[PDB]
């Protein structure tokens, strides 16, 4: 019932940068404010309790300040492993409530993706469907354009993308694009191609195969 307003919702910063996240409760909570870190698929971890007390085992670059109705989490020197979503949590009145979170991403140098294309397996074709997969490996930044072309005709509406979370050591992303076709449509064409445009590529990179070669 106490509403926690966190800001910003998301930020990007370079390694070594000083990062600042604020939390404002809807009423005064004295010093009863905790800060959490949540890395993807890991247990959320308590970083700071009672506004300014560093939890045991947490690196000293994390620090909390403030009281009353304004609180700040500072990351004094951003490290690659600090990619995570951070939350404030008031412990003043029940029920405990959380801010909606701040997504922290790492800015780093441009890294072009390595590109791979995979044809559908013969085992899948017996099912009546053909999946064609394109892989973009270990790139930065996250933005990339991936176009499917079948006999050089541009595809639309029949593919889905998925992106990994930012890597905790090299801060890169990887991305899959999957083209789904009926077996009948797959056998009507020859050249299957994934064309990749990315800031690290001076011109687009195309990977292709010919069905049945």
């Amino acid at each position: 019932d106490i509403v926690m307003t966190q800001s910003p919702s998301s930020l990007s910063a370079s390694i070594g940068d000083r990062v600042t996240i604020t939390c404002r409760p809807s009423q005064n909570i004295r010093s009863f404010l905790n800060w959490f870190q949540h890395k993807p698929g890991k247990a959320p971890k308590l970083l700071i309790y009672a506004a300014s007390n560093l939890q045991s085992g947490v690196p000293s670059r994390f620090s909390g300040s403030g009281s009353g109705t304004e609180f700040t989490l500072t990351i004094r020197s951003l490290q690659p492993e600090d990619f995570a979503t951070y939350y404030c949590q008031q412990s003043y009145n029940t029920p405990p409530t959380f801010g909606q979170g701040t997504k922290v991403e790492i800015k780093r140098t441009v890294a072009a993706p390595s590109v791979f294309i995979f044809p559908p397996s013969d085992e899948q074709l017996k099912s009546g469907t053909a999946s064609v997969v394109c892989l973009l490996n270990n790139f930065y930044p996250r933005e990339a354009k991936v176009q499917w072309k079948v006999d050089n005709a541009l595809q639309s509406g029949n593919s889905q993308e998925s992106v990994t979370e930012q890597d905790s050591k090299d801060s890169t992303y990887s991305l899959s694009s999957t083209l789904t076709l009926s077996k009948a449509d797959y056998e009507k064409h020859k050249v299957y191609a994934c064309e990749v445009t990315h800031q690290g590529l001076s011109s687009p990179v195309t990977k292709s195969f010919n069905r049945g070669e």
Partner: protein, 221 residues
């Protein structure tokens, strides 16, 4: 200093009751200095605190949920549990158990969960479980290969390589929901091209909701 192992069904039908258990190791659930908490997070939504329970009997549940939730402690098993009635799609979420240490100088009672479990996803749906079909992403200095894990429900699947021996260079993509209502993902790994002739690569796909385990060899051609 504490380990918290969560268990329970990952699929619950609408209007039925969701039950989860947290197995505690390293301290006793009868120790009066700790309290035990559940928290949840729907996909893409915020965290919602559910409640706390002390062994001495004192409890407090979020007013949003108090009329549907109970918690209990099983001393013989050193466990505690969550019971949530009459579930709907709003109850689809990752559920976290957590321990806190009572300390009124730095926290109101029962309000600072400081050791959390890693969470378990519960999906509320009338659909049955379905195990995945697994297809090779065959390799064409560095080569890429993988496994396509198609048409399963609900999440999650786990993917390992070479029974867990191969970890360097692996990317397992987040699942995507297909228009069919079933999930799909791929797991890839980059390896030396010089290895393709003599190293065997197998992806191991585990889908606990369907008690399904599938091994797929991934080779050239």
């Amino acid at each position: 200093q504490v380990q918290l192992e969560e268990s329970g069904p990952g699929l619950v039908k609408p209007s039925e009751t969701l039950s989860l258990t947290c197995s505690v190791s390293g301290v006793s659930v009868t120790s009066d200095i700790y309290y035990w908490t559940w928290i949840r997070q729907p996909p893409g939504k915020g965290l919602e605190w559910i409640g706390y329970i002390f062994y001495n009997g004192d409890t407090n549940y979020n007013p949003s949920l108090k009329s549907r939730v109970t918690m209990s402690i099983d001393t013989s098993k050193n466990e505690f549990s969550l019971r949530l009635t009459s579930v709907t799609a709003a109850d689809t979420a990752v559920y976290f158990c957590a321990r806190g240490t009572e300390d009124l100088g730095y926290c109101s009672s029962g309000s600072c969960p400081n050791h959390w479990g890693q969470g378990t996803l519960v999906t509320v749906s009338s659909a049955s479980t379905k195990g995945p079909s697994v297809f090779p992403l065959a390799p064409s200095g560095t080569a890429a290969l993988g496994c396509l894990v198609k048409d399963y429900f609900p999440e999650p699947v786990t993917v390992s390589w070479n029974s867990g021996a191969l970890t360097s260079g692996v990317h397992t993509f987040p699942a995507v929901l297909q228009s069919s209502g079933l999930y799909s993902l791929s797991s890839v790994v980059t390896v030396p091209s010089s290895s393709l002739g003599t190293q065997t690569y197998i992806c191991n796909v585990n889908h606990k909701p369907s008690n399904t385990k599938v091994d797929k060899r991934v080779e050239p051609k």
